[PDB]
Amino acid sequence: MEFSATGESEDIKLHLVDNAMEMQIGANEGQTILANIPQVDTTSLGIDD
Amino acid sequence: SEKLRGQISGLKRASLNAQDGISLLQTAEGGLQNIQDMLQRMRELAVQAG
User: Fold this and answer.
1) What per-residue string of b and e applies to A18-34 under the rule 16 or more CB within 10 Å gives b?
2) What is the protein's known function (chain B) (predicted)?
3) What distance in Å separates the CA atoms of residue A46 and residue B22, rounded to the nearest whole number?
4) Which end of chain B, N or C, is more open, meaning fewer C-beta atoms within 10 Å of its C-beta?
5) Among A45, A30, A4, A12, CA closest to B50
6) CA-CA distance, B33 to B17, in Å (whole number)?
């Protein structure tokens, strides 16, 4: 068997939008707390295979 | 006598006129107080969301 490089470039385009949790903790502007929860599954833990 | 009677009558008329005027400002103040009370509930419910 023999393998070789294709020789021509390939393009893949990625779309991505931010969406944390914002909590109002004060009685005026700006006073807030930001919360994040990462994704957890077999793929993230790297034991899927 | 004529001058003094004229002045007395004028003073009485002005005395009535002043109270006639003051009633209007009383009513306006009442209405404005109602509006002010409403705006605070609006503010509280606005800060409810967030």
Assistant:
1) eeeeeeeeeeeeeeeee
2) Flagellin is the subunit protein which polymerizes to form the filaments of bacterial flagella.
3) 82
4) N
5) A30
6) 26
Measured at the CA of B33, the angle between CA B29 and CA B35, to 5 degrees, comes to 120
Contact residues for A37 (Cβ-Cβ < 8 A; gap 6+)? A21
What type of residue is B28? A
CB-CB under 8 Å, A24 with B50: yes
Q: Does B47 touch chain A (CB under 8 A)?
A: yes
Method used to solve the structure: cryo-EM
Distance of alpha carbon B35 from its chain centroid, rounded?
A: 15
Q: DSSP strand E in chain A: where? A: 21-24, 32-35
**Residue B46 contacts A where some CB pair is shorter than 8 Å:** no
- The dihedral region occupied by A7, where left means phi > 0, alpha psi between -120 and 50, and beta the remainder, is left
B50 vs A contacts (CB less than 8 Å): 22, 24
Among A36, A33, A13, A11, smallest CA distance to A23 is for: A33
